[PDB]
Design a protein around this ligand. Structure first.
Ligand code: HEM
Length: 153
């Protein structure tokens, strides 16, 4: 459970993301795919991308980043009251995409790294701590949904 203050810090930095969602999304995917190359292997639509400049140039990957962040943004703005937003996400990611919880840990790490890189003066130790907790909550709740659907990833 996050405090009200924690949620405010989360949402304060999120508003910075929303000034350039596409650019944040690109940087997060590029970070994820560099740090954990197996995740890219998992995306049939993107696994052909061989270099960082190809990744940055892909309109399709840029659009997907906006989709990912828009969904995460809508989740965070519910401040933990996110069942209606999380369920379909769990459904797809468990049953269609087959994404294990550990890949969600990887992209959470990517998010935190990008936000710190771009917004250090609004992403100090307390804001990082709040965002860590929000993303932990997201992963905990997605994991319970995966189990409910029969997926132990
Ligand atoms: C913050 C975490 C995440 C969010 C909010 C998110 C959100 C989304 C959304 C909204 C879509 C499109 C709708 C859908 O199919 O459900 C999508 C598709 C996808 N997700 Fe995620 N996702 C997340 C993490 C990941 C990670 C870590 C992977 C790593 C493999 C992944 C792989 C995919 C794939 C393969 C698709 C389908 C893309 C396509 O072929 O069009 N997701 N995700």
């Amino acid at each position: 459970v996050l405090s009200e203050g924690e949620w405010q810090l989360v949402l304060h930095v999120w508003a910075k993301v929303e000034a350039d969602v596409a650019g944040h999304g690109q940087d997060i995917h590029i970070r994820l795919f560099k740090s954990h190359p197996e995740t890219l292997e998992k995306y049939d639509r993107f696994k052909h991308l061989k270099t960082e400049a190809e990744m940055k140039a892909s309109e399709d990957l840029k659009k997907h980043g906006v989709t990912v962040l828009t969904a995460l943004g809508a989740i965070l703005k519910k401040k933990g009251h996110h069942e209606a937003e999380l369920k379909p996400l769990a459904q797809s990611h468990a049953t269609k995409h087959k994404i294990p919880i550990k890949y969600l840990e990887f992209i959470s790490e990517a998010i935190i790294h990008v936000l710190h890189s771009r917004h250090p003066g609004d992403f100090g130790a307390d804001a990082q701590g709040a965002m860590n907790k929000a993303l932990e909550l997201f992963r905990k709740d997605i994991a319970a949904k995966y189990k409910e659907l029969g997926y132990q990833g």
